[PDB]
Each structure stands twice: as structure tokens, then as C-alpha cells.
């Protein structure tokens, strides 16, 4: 709820290059600097005689919003022999997938084709490039002697990727073995140690991979998506991958062990063609210290209110149990054809309340299908199913392809170093990427007392200011105390609004007024020091004369509400704090007239 | 003051065929096309349809990598390794608009060649959609139960299968035939079942799946997601098409579901179907029906299953 | 071996 | 803590034969019987014209404790030609290493010498024999054409041996390549398929063996000892070996992949001449399923409390991390010159408490240097460094050599089929071997309630039977529950002993008495069923009259102790269960008098 | 009553001292490795005596020197069991080698220098196989066998060990089938170590204790790179010192005198026994310095020593290799 | 050939 929609950082790329198809952060270390990363899969490059060879750019956070491509490979199509092209880097979609871990950067080209050393063929084995400081190496684990479709010929390695806690790569290739798909994992220390530019099919010792299976598994797309997280307590990150066309297209999500690639758990969708497994994510969403699994099914259609079917989408939420089980809960979309669940981005603690949070995108929803993103906050009981914030796409369709705001996104990094995780969103349909900054959260403890509460009309104690009349008075004391995590000043300006006898309407007569105003309402501009003790203001109210109103039974409600002056609490960049949406910004008490007695 | 539905616990009741042969001409279908050649359709069907017509079209898959081989020798002839007389692959081709001259269909089929590609699943929903929205090219008759017979032996490609080929732009659901050929087969991804179902319903088109192998049960398990559609297993001994299409048409007319549309920004439509004995009812020609609708408050249709009442 | 659409041929 | 010392099974061999130098179990599984295997390196035989060739005896556990010799090779020295002896089986120390897996037995003679096929030499290549039920064969991989010290001529193959999970042998030979040492692993299926008694240098197809290296590694002793365990998560057992003189005598331990014999991990001792690596063992000790490594350094000396050195020996425990490196602790010895760490024997789950255990010997420690064994139990956190049991050698040195009780031992086999692993201990110095049986462990939960706990002298409710009087009563209830694993009686019998007002001594008047006895003590023989529901017994006590005692402040403590009737709980063989280690010998409650 | 020692006193924070008597009488024993690798060093040992007395007169107050040799255990696999080489381990190289042996005592401590000169010149070379040699077996026998060698009562007992290679350890004998630990007694039936084939080598612990109990200081005369081996073992053997023989030889006399100087400058202290339970010693030098008990004090000559010892919760306190033990008890 | 007899070698 605290993402700054007022002044988001916007980044642009060359037209038609799908700038924003993939995004991520980059915190190299060895220096106090940070940057973004954005993928342009259809970008034209200077590589000799190559069309739309793809490219990944590095957009900087410091002041200006300028991006520069990363020369991963300035060469062209190498030759296996005279006039015999070894590779085909045109339309390879380099940058279709991006992923960074500290100094290492890994981009891939799912549609890179190569010749095979054995025959003049054009096979999309897919390749990836890895950079670390000044070193840059190629990584095509599917570029092997195991060729053709029954082998790794169409694997399209790098389709999806991810790092691990201990510097192991995880790579998907849904084409392997007649589209059974495949997963591959290699130690980063081996991708660089065993790299040889004259060798085209490199073999790594400590490699883990899935093997070919029976033909029934054909057309499963193992490796269509990937995530990582521990699911057996060993500490070693395990491998989670979506298999959308699995189980007669019900879809599945395989979990393999990260130490020996042995199967651990299976998930199985429940609707055919729902593409259960288009997206996957893992993160502890309830402070239990156990990674929780999120699975996307963008094409799921639920039986609506009128017994009719309509495509909305659905994400499944599973909480890892100490026993190894999963407490699974579901979550449908809101708008039709919005493809809810296309992207699922862990965020960390977006509000610094103790539990991690997650973003979920519906790239074809909203006004004019400009795309939407939904923010969901986590709790000890699980995921709060009502989103706390909605990000609306700002760009109308350019030419043919919708903007696709939310198709990709990445979070969990505090780039402005303010204390709160920030978020990146991409819209390749207009070649854009946006960086939403997390606003700090102020938590307010408000208190309100009204004494006495049983009011006695004939108990006339206080005298009106200046005059000699006497009225039945009673005190109203409101208290205000606040603090917050992150970059804030030491004093906050609030705007308190009190109202007496709220139940009464405009035409109805109001029975309780304030001693020094003779009015129901009372405004105040209070100013508390941050993290201080309770600061209170004591007021004196009174009742109208006994003979001015007839209703003595209806209660007299006393309502308070406090706003915060945001424009003034801004930091060095104009990022304004926000009030913790958890608590109600209002509280109400009550007092009643005393009737008869003895 | 009337239509074919009455009217134009509150209940409601109800009171010319165009067939389009959309056939998979992939390599795996080499044995079924030779049986599709042969006239008898009209023999069995003339008494019940009260005059009818039939068109013809073919589909294979999207003509891009990795669904086909991009090798120059087979990019145009996907059967180069077997030097077979295969025609080029294609997403969808329209050869014969709805015509009453039966001999033209017989000629258009006999003249048909076989294509080929790589991955088992075929891009059939791509052709089905175009056949539904493209009314001027096919010529769907106004007041006529519009039928679309899809003939294949394998599962179909889904919307997001196209991500592999780098196709990420959703299907727009319009007609794209510059010269009776689907041109967007390489730019728009396959349609989803929701997109397919809605466009199928909006044109009052009922689907008949003519499938052969074990993959018949696949299309069978999807009929709940496509109201107005039916499936039937071709016997691998072939020459069963005529008995299946008539059996499919009979069962199709016995099915009488009901659906809704729009609202007044907040209404319940708690329908409750009652049979003469799921909103439909089979084994019911001009016999009574009845559906109970419940209505509430907190402003512009009720659509019968593929039929021709606001 | 050879599976898929060209398997029956082969 | 549960090893039976009251009546162990003692086996004895021929004098001076070093009977007990090497011990192991034999569980054929094609006979549904179980035996002990004992090595007698310096025993005389009937082999023609041979002296101290050595034997291996099969000692039977059932019925009397009588051993028989196994007949592996009844022939004498073969001849390469007339009057050109091929073999020199005299003083070959056959049986110095024994190691049995299923119906397959493997003995070795590390001092066997042979002539070689190229030269009238006499070199100790060492040899082994392998019996499998009805067929027995020879196995001498160091008896090859790689003769002389430059090769395997002095390898002494069989100095240490071990089997693996997947029917492979691991054999060590500390003398190969001018004592660099060597490891050799051959499939058992081929040691039998290729054997030929007229071929002296046999080729094995799938042999794995270390390779001669730089001369700096001379005098290393690779293969001095061997163990097996997975250390790279491949499922196949990997090879672990001590190299006691490696690294300028700091000692080392090499680990090799059990699939292609490529080096995996290196341990290294900290002190010179400690002989780090004399013994090695590999077993999961903390229930993680990762083989943990145990290394002995018998001659290690620790800077003692007085700033002076003293040789006590040291073992190093190393837990295998999931990351892949090891978490290592060290554990020193107790008595001087006891050679703590000469032998290390995994025991399995000695108390079936969920974690495997281990024994560690000090052959030359104790009263009169008769040898001691130290039983250490494992925990989830590692190895509990406090020994729960001590086994003391019970024989005085016959002559010349110390008994060496514990120099060799083997365990992790439940020979009596009672669900608890037993232990064999050998003392070759007196030609003896003991079978220590593991007693069943009973876990007992005891309960004791006292209500009310504040007693009112003027609250006279219960009537004292036998008199017209009334007294202030309070209830004493005690419960008991018992269970155990494995072979146990269906019902156990505990003798409960309650005493009231225990803080008073003879003479001091006891304030509270039992209603139906008018006595401060109460005895009951309670009988509960193992694994059944708890059994309680409710009692009633009362206080003396106000005019019979003056002290009202001292608490009235209620003391309970509950023995077990061991003799009756014993099984058919007289092996009686044992109460779990940390079971209180007594539980106590309290009640107080109420003043004013 | 009396105080008849060289340490003050002879029999809580009580101080103790020692009297650094100047001009000690010395008893040296040349225990030399006569393995084949030493073939070039024995020829250099011949004329070391006469000059030794020349150089040693300045520091010693009359002295003697004995001689013995060692090779290795005369069993397989340390030697060749071939009949032709069992007695002559140099048969392939037809050299005039004497038989191998564990330890031989040829010349008891004698003050007649010409006697040492004769016993060395008469010495032959042996041979065996494995590089390491069994030296510790001989050192022990030379220490415990007091009646055969004749160690003088009042004489700083010196033992020069001369070798060029590392030594066999206690448990190396398992290869030979020798598994009975060393008993640490004297086993010379006729000036010949008989148990070399029945008892395993002694451990460093056993060796240290027997060296200290007989007040014997060791000098390691080593040549090759293996000098650093014996150097790295002096922490485990109090009272010993090492010296690298120059590969050009003629360094025995310079090491023994140079080693003796440092040995007399070294004054460590050790403990012994207890009452079933610290003895937190703190040694102090002639120059104000806080030196640990075992730290001794270097560069001391006939000057005072000191070191207050604290005892809290029959025992002996031995200066390192001195002929005087000041016992303490309650 | 190394060991004790190597110098001779
Ligand atoms: C690929 O590698 C993985 C390893 O990552 C491997 O999985 C192992 O499988 C083996 C057997 O197949 C298991 O070994 C058994 O483990 C039994 C005890 O395991 C329980 O306790 C474990 C102890 O861990 C605790 O302590 C450590 C250190 O404090 C700490 O790291 C832990 O968090 C925990 O506190 C525990 O790790 C383990 O957890 C697994 O199981 C639970 C179900 O109970 C599940 O919920 C978890 O998600 C996790 O999967 C488990 O709880 C042990 O008693 C048992 O011993 C018996 O059998 C052996 C023979 O194997 C006998 O020798 C012994 O005497 C007993 O009879 C055995 O050792 C091991 O625990 C698994 N490890 C993991 C991390 O899952 C796969 O099999 C490998 N696949 C292939 C194809 O090789
Ligand atoms: C007639 O009306 C007058 C007022 O018009 C009334 O006098 C006031 O009564 C209230 C009680 O309703 C008194 O409030 C208390 O003040 C004392 C201090 O003197 C506090 O300690 C009291 O305890 C708590 O009050 C709050 C909760 O109610 C807490 O927030 C607070 O921290 C204390 O813990 C309480 O606040 C008030 O002091 C008097 N004022 C005067 C001037 O007397 C009178 O009692 C009425 N009489 C009749 C017969 O109706
Ligand atoms: C806050 O209240 C004070 C009253 O003293 C007023 O002067 C000031 O203008 C107010 N500020 C805002 C932002 O309303
Ligand atoms: C008070 O705050 C709550 C939020 O908890 C809100 O729902 C409610 O409408 C508010 N009431 C008024 C009168 O503002
Ligand atoms: C005894 O030794 C201590 C060491 O701390 C020293 O302070 C003290 O002076 C010594 N005794 C005397 C008498 O000096
Ligand atoms: Ca894991
Ligand atoms: Ca969790
Ligand atoms: Ca949160
Ligand atoms: Ca931030
Ligand atoms: Ca296809
Ligand atoms: Ca292994
Ligand atoms: Ca372990
Ligand atoms: Ca245990
Ligand atoms: Ca047992
Ligand atoms: Ca030697
Ligand atoms: Mg096909
Ligand atoms: Mg030598």
C-alpha cells in the first residue's frame, strides 16, 4: 500500500524491441552502487550481420534514467568451416530472460539456433551468457552431441533461469526430448573453470539434470518456469519448475532436490488448459521460516455468479509445513481475460511489518487493457487475500500488441537505501520499465477518553468562558503517538478532527457542544515528536440546556479521525511517508444522558 | 410478434444446416484423408436437415520455429527426409466457402495434399476461431444451425504454447484473411478456450470434434468448457464419419442449455433447470422445456445454446 | 527415435 | 550403558596364536544361524611343512562356546618349477584381518611372500582368500608383474580390508611403491569369475587402484586402515583410508570416490608422530544420514594441566555437513600410555534410542594395563563426549606381551536376535575374545501426587480404623508407566517404597503415618504391562495428634523409590533388562502443616 | 637436615634455585647410523676424536666418549629376506657390507681417546631397504643400559645421534607383525640388542620419560633436508637439541661444542607426580623477565637462577637433565 | 630404485 505512485522512475528503450520483457536488480558489491537491468529480446545490435540479436541494458538509479547496453558478445555467427555457419544469432531473443546475483549476471537467448557438428541443421538449443567483473563466458548446456528433437536439439535452454543461495544456476528448457522439457543446474565455479571458446559442447563434472522419460510425457514443457527454495530442511535450495502441458494439460509443478535432482513433491492443477505452471515463485510469506510456493494459472476460468464460465485466472498459495505437507489455498482473478497470475514477484517485507509480501500481475486488465498489478500482504495465518494496492498501466496500445504492463517484474531489493523493498515493473508492449519506490510507514497509536460518561443534566459545574452561566461539562481527551521504520524526520504534523453527537444529522439538533467554541466539531493541528511518549490534549464539552431538545435516549457518539501532512514529511527525494493502513485512522467513544433515578 | 423462442418461480420455454469441414492435414493424418474422399453424407442427412450445404478447409500448425523445421529444404516441404509429396505447412487455409454444390466439396477434397510439422500437438483452435468470425469468407447462413466439424487425431496447441516461438501478443478474435489465408498465424498466439468459447457462442456455432486415437478422451474432457460442442471418436477402421456426424447432430439438437449476458451492475441469475422427466436436457423434436429463473435487485440478454431473447 | 507428427510415416 | 558385563561369553584359542587379533560376525542368511569369526595369525596348522601360517576360526554363539577352524587353503607351498618354490606361506599371518559380509568371508595374510615369475626373490605381496559358501578362491592383486619395491612387491595387500554396499572389496597395501601405499577395489563377482589356481597374476576387468606418484610421498603407508561410506551423495560407498606417516608424519586420511578412485577429501593431523590415521571408521552418528568420519591418533600427547606433556592418544570426530565440508571435534584420552584410539568400532544403535553409537579402545590402560573399552553414545548434536560405559580387561598378561584387550573389536550385529547390537572384543595377548550382549532398555515414567498439600490439624475427617478417633488425612497417589523396544516381557514388576516425613532420622518422631498401617513406610509390588496404560495406586495418610509432636515448620517430604525386579524380567538366556540411563532413583513431593 | 645437592633447596609460594657449576665433566656417546645412505659420513667420523679432545678441553673438565651403531630391525619388510642378502643387504652392488642389526655396543665410555679412535676406524657399513631407520630403539637401550655403557654418576650425559634420515615410529612395526609395545628395559645379552625383532619401536613419550629419568641430554647430528624433521620435534622432547651437519662434513666437532654451549645455557624445569590433584610455576631469568616454567632461561654462565613456584589444590622437581632432583612432599 | 640403497646405485 506504500508504493509511491506519485513520482515513479520511468525508463524507455528503442521502439519495437520489447524493452521490459525481463527485469531485475543488480547490486555488484565492492562499491556502494546499484542499478537496474532490463531485457530487450528483439533489439537490433551492432553484431556483424545480425538482425534483432537481442540485448540486455543496464539502467542506472543515480539521478538520470539513462540505460546503456551490456556488450555480452560483440561477435557474429561463428563458422564451423568455410562458408558453414556454426550458429544463428539472428532472432535469438537474447535478453528474453534476465537474472542477477551480486556480481554475476546471467542472460539467455531461448531462440538461438546452431548447426550441430554432425550435420547441416538449424536447431534451437538456446544459449546463455554469464558475466562476472571483467570475465564473460558462454553457457549452452543443451548445445551438445545429443541432437535432434528426441535429444536436446530444441531444448531452448535459458527459457527460464534463477540463481541459488550457494551459487548454482538453475535453467529450464521446455523443448528437450520432444517437449518433455528439462532442468539443468551447474556450479558457477564450473561454468567459468571449464569454459573453452574453441569447444562448442562443454561438459561439466558437478552437473545435475533430468533425464529423458517415456513418450507419454511428450509435450509437457518441463522448465517453462522456475523458482528455488528449500523444501527439506537441508539448507540447500531446491528446484521448483512449472510443467504447464503436463497431466493431460492439467498442468503440474515439479519440485526436485537441489543436491541430487531427486523428485520431492508434485503439484497438479485442477482445470484443463488453465496453464497451471506458467509462473512460479517461492518465499516465506508468514514468518514461519519455511519457503511457500506460489503457482500461476493465467487461463483459468471460474464458474461465476450466474453459473457461467469466464476466463479470469487463478494463483494457488501453498504453505510449507514442518511435517513436509502443504496447506494450499487458491485465489482467483477479478477482471476477465486479464490473465491474472501471469507474473508473481516476491517483494520481501514491502511495509516492514514482519511478514513478506508478494506482487501478482494481470497484464491485460484495467482500462483499455493497459495492464494491472496487485499487491498482497502476508500474515502469520498466510496471505491476506484482499490486495492492498493496485498499479494501473499508463500507456495505451502502441501498434497491435497490448502494453502488457505486469508481464514481468522484480522486487525484494531496497535500491534507494531507505529501508523498504522497491519494485520494478515491465511493459514490453510499449518498451517501458517502471521502478516504484516504497514509501515509509508511520504507525499511530491513538487514544480517546470521555469522562464522565454518564452525564447528569442537573450537575452544572463549569461556567461558559466569559459569562456567568453554568452547564454540565465533561472532558474529552485525545492522545496521539507515532513512530516508523526508515528515513523520516523527528516531528510529524497531524490533523485531528473531533465531532460530538455524530449520530445526529444536519437537520437534527445537536446536544453536545465544545465549551470554547459552542459547536459540535473541533479541528486541531497537533505536532508530536517521532517515537516520543503519548502526547494528549484535554478538552471541555458541555450539554445544551435541558429545555432545548427532547431526545435523551439516543447515545451521544464522539468520533475522532487523524490525518497526516504528507507533503511536509518528505525525504531528500520527495518520497512521502504514508500511514499504516493496518490500523483505522479513526476511533469512536460514547456518553449518555442520565435519566431519573433516586 | 415472434421468433423461434418463447418469449422474445418465473419459467421460460423454447420452440437449414451449414457444415464446415475443418480437417487437420498434418503428417499423422495421412491415413484418414484417404478415407475422407467419399456423396453418402447427403444420402443419410437429406431427410433430417431439410436442405443443407457444406464447406471445407484445412489446418496444420504455426509455420515458425520450433513448431516446424526452419531448414530450407523442409521449411517449405516438411517431408524432405522422406522425399514425400507434401504441400507446405500452414496455419489455416480456406479453399471452399459454404456451397450447395456437393460435387465441389468432393473435388476440393480429392485434390487435397498432406503437410507435415514436428511437434505432435497441432494448431487447431487457430483455424476454428477464423472459421467462426470470418462470416463473409465462409458465408454462414443467417437462420441456419451453424456446424463446424473439426477433424484431427491429436491434441491441440493452447494459447501460451506460443511463448516458445516468441509469440506473446494475445489473439484479438477478428477475421484476418487477405486472400482466403490466415496471415496472423505467425503473429498472434493461439486462442484460449474462453476466447474460443465466447467467439463460438457469439456466432451461434456448434462444434463437432472428429477424433480417432486415444486422444479422443482429451477432447471429451473439454466439452464442459465449451457449451454447444460435441465430440465423437472416429473408428480407426475409418469410413465412420457419416454415422458420427448424424449421431452428433441428433445429440446436439437434444441439448438445450441456457446462458446469460450483462447485468444491471449487480444482479443474481439463479437459474434452476427442470427437465420433462447443467441447464440442458438430452433424450428429450418439438417438445416442452422449462427453466426457472430467480431475479433480484442490487441496463441491457439470454442466449440459447448456439441457437439463432433480450 | 522419431516421434511426433512425422512418427507414423516411418 | 546397557552392555551386559555380568555373564559375557568368553572364547579362547591356542596359546601364543594371537587368537583375537581380528574379530567379526558371520551371518550367512542361507543358514539362519550366526557365528563369530576370530583371527589367529600365529597359529600352527596342518598345511604340509608350514609354520604359523595362521587360521581363522568360526566360533559358534549357540550352545557351548566352541570354535572350529575354517578350511580355506589346505595345500602347502606351490612350486613354480622343481625345487623352485613359488610361495612362502610360513609366518604369513593369515587371519590378521577378517571382514565378513553375508555368506562371504574374506581373510588375508599380509606377510605372505612369493618368488615372482621373473626372479628368485622373496617379496611380501600379501594375499587373500574369499569363501562364498561352497566355493573358495584366492585373491592377490599385488601378486603381479609390478615386482620389486619400485612396484607392488612389498605391498602387503590385505593389511586392511573392508566390504562395500554394492558387492565390492576395498583392500589396502601400505608397502606399494616404496611404502607410498595403495588402495585396490575389485568387484566380488569378478574375483570369483576370473580365479584360476594355475595363474598367479590374475587380471581383473573393473579394478580400481591408486597410482604411483612423486618420490616425496615415500614412507606414507596408504592403506594402513580402511573404512567405507558415501561422501559425495552418489549412493555408492566411497573409500576412506589412513595414511599415518603422510605429510612429514603429521598423518593424513584420503577419501576416494568409490566409482573411479579420484581423490575427494583430505584430513591432516596436527601433531608429528601421533600416528594420526592408525584407525579409521565411517558411520552416521547424528541421525542425519551423512557418514561421519572417526580417526584415531594413539600416540598423541596433550599439554596437560601441569604444563607438561603426556601421551594419552586422541580421536577426532568429523560430522559430514550437507554443504559438503566436515564439522570436526576432537576427543582426547584419559590414562597415560594407554594408546587410546588403537581401535574404533561402530556399534549401530546400541540403545535403539534413534542415534548410532561407537566404541573406542585403549588396549594398554586400566588396572595393571589389561585394556579398556569406552562406549560413546551419539546425539543429534554429535557424539556425547562422556562415555556411558567402561569395559575393563579381566586377564593378567600371560607372558611377554600385554593382553591388548580392545586392540580389535567389531559390532553392529544383533547376534541373539533381541533387537540390540552386540559387541565382540579381542585380546590377542592372552588369546581371548568376548561377546558382549546389549541389554534391553526400559523407559519408565513415574508419577506422585499429594493432595491436599496444606494440612489442617483441626481438620479431622477420616476415621482411623481400630479406634473411635478421627485424624487429619491427606491422599498420596503414585503412578507408574513402562515401555521398551525389542524383545521384552509382556509385564514388568516394580517394587515401590514410599516413606513419609523423610527429613527426620531415627529417634525423631515421624509426624505422618499411613492410615491402614500406622507406619511411615509402605511397600507394594506393582505390576504394569510394557506399552500398556499407566497403573496408579491411591493411598491415605494422616497426622499424629497435636499433643504428640511440637515441630510444625519442617516440611513433610514424601520420598519414593521404585526398583525393578531384574531377575524375573530376564529372558530365556538370563539377560535382564536395564532401566534407561537417566532415570531418577527417587521422586519426592511435599506437604506442610498449616499454622494458625 | 643437610642440604646436599646442586639445587637450592635439596628437599604456598616458595622459591627455588640451581647452582650452575662451571666446568662440568662430560660423558659423550656417539650413536651413529651405519645404514648405506651414511656410507660417506662414517669415513668422516674417523679422525673426529683426537680433535674433539683438543676442542673439548676448553669447556670440559676431563671427559670420555663411547661408541655404538644402529641400522634397523632385522626382519621383513625392513630388510631383504633373500638368503644371499639376509646377511649382506648389498649383494646386488657387491660391496663389503656387514650384516644389518638393531643396535650394537662396541665401546663403553672410555677416557682413552685412542680407544674411540680404534673402535671407529674398525667400523663397517650396513644396509637395508626402507629409508626410515630404527634409531629410537637404540637410543632407549643406550639410556637404560647403564651398567653396559657405564654412564658416570656425576657427568652431564651427552648422546650424539648421527643420522641422515627420519626414524621409524612405534606403530610402524605392525607391518612386520610386531604388536607388543616396548617395555623400556635393558636387553643386551652380549652387548647386542636382542628384542629388536620382538618389541615394536618406542614412542616419543616412552623415549622422553626414560631420557629424563636418567638425566640424558640428546644432540641430533643430522645432514640432509631431514634436519628440519628433527628440528620440528624438539618441542616434544625437552632436553634435546638439533644441529645440521654441513654436507661438506668436518662439522661434528663444531656442532658438539656449539651444541654443548647452548645446552649448559638452557635451564628448564619440570614437574612429577601429585597428591591426586596445579604447580603453577613462573620462572624468572637473571634479567627481569617473566618466563613460563618450562621456558627456562638462555644466555645464563655461573650466575644465579630463580623462579617462584606456587603449589595449591610425594612429588619431585627435576631440572632438565641435571644430576640433582629436589623432591617435595607433605 | 630408491630408499637406503639409492645413493650407492
Ligand atoms: C538426495 O539427498 C537427500 C538428502 O538431502 C536424501 O534424503 C535423505 O534420505 C535418507 C534416506 O533415504 C534420510 O536418511 C534417514 O534419516 C532418518 C532421520 O531423518 C529425519 O531426521 C533428519 C535429521 O535432521 C535433523 O537434524 C539435522 C541436524 O540437526 C537438521 O539439519 C534437520 O533440520 C533436523 O533437525 C531430518 O533431516 C529428516 O528430514 C527429512 O525427513 C522428514 C520426515 O521425517 C521430512 O519432513 C523432511 O522434509 C526431510 O525430507 C528426517 O526428518 C534416519 O533415522 C534414518 O536412519 C535409519 O535408516 C538408516 C538407513 O538409511 C539406518 O542406518 C538407521 O540406523 C535408521 O534405521 C536415515 O538415516 C535422510 O534423512 C534424507 N535427508 C533429507 C534432507 O531429506 C535423498 O534420499 C537423496 N536421493 C537420492 C536418490 O539419493
Ligand atoms: C459533575 O460534572 C463534573 C465535570 O463536568 C465532574 O467533575 C469531574 O469528574 C470527572 C469524572 O468523570 C473527573 O475525572 C477524574 O479526574 C481524576 C483527577 O482528579 C482522575 O484521576 C480520574 O481517573 C482517571 O480518568 C480517566 C478515565 O476516566 C483516565 O484517563 C485518567 O488517566 C485517570 O486514570 C478521572 O479522570 C474530574 O476530575 C472531575 N473534575 C472536577 C473539577 O471535579 C463531577 O464529578 C460531576 N458530578 C456529578 C455528581 O455528576
Ligand atoms: C495547522 O493549524 C494551524 C493552527 O495554529 C494553522 O495556522 C496552520 O495553517 C495549519 N496548517 C495546515 C497545513 O492546515
Ligand atoms: C473509519 O475508519 C474505517 C477504517 O477502519 C472506515 O471503514 C470507516 O468508513 C471510517 N469511518 C468514518 C466515519 O470515516
Ligand atoms: C612468588 O611468585 C610470585 C609470582 O606472582 C611473585 O609475585 C612473588 O614475589 C614470589 N615470592 C616472593 C617472596 O617474591
Ligand atoms: Ca533442500
Ligand atoms: Ca512459510
Ligand atoms: Ca509485509
Ligand atoms: Ca526502497
Ligand atoms: Ca504440431
Ligand atoms: Ca560416493
Ligand atoms: Ca552424520
Ligand atoms: Ca544409540
Ligand atoms: Ca543383541
Ligand atoms: Ca630402514
Ligand atoms: Mg499431426
Ligand atoms: Mg639410511
Residue numbers in the entry:
A (entry chain A): 1 to 598
B (entry chain B): 72 to 79, 92 to 98, 104 to 126, 129 to 367, 374 to 380, 382 to 395, 404 to 405, 407 to 414, ...
C (entry chain E): 213 to 222
D (entry chain C): 1 to 596
E (entry chain D): 70 to 80, 91 to 356, 358 to 380, 382 to 394, 405 to 421
F (entry chain F): 214 to 222
Paper excerpt:
However, two integrins, αVβ6 and αVβ8, appear to have evolved primarily to activate transforming growth factor-β1 (TGF-β1) and TGF-β3 and bind with high affinity to a RGDLXX(L/I) motif in the TGF-β prodomain.
An integrin αVβ8 headpiece fragment with high mannose N-glycans was expressed in GnTI-deficient HEK293 cells, purified, crystallized, and soaked with or without the TGF-β1 ligand peptide G213RRGDLATIHG223. The R215GDLATI221 sequence motif in the TGF-β1 peptide binds to αVβ8. The ligand Arg-215 sidechain hydrogen bonds to the αV Asp-218 sidechain. Compared to unliganded β8, specificity-determining loop 1 (SDL1) at the beginning of the α1-helix with its MIDAS-coordinating residues moves toward the Mg2+. This movement enables coordination of Ser-116, that is, the β-MIDAS S5 residue, to the MIDAS Mg2+ and a hydrogen bond of the Asp-217 sidechain to the SDL1 backbone. The ligand LATI sequence has an α-helix-like conformation with its hydrophobic Leu-218 and Ile-221 in a pocket formed by the β8 SDL2 loop. In response to binding soaked-in TGF-β1 peptide, in αVβ8 the β-MIDAS D/N8 equivalent Asn-119 residue moves 1.8 Å and the β-MIDAS S5 Ser-116 residue moves 1.4 Å.
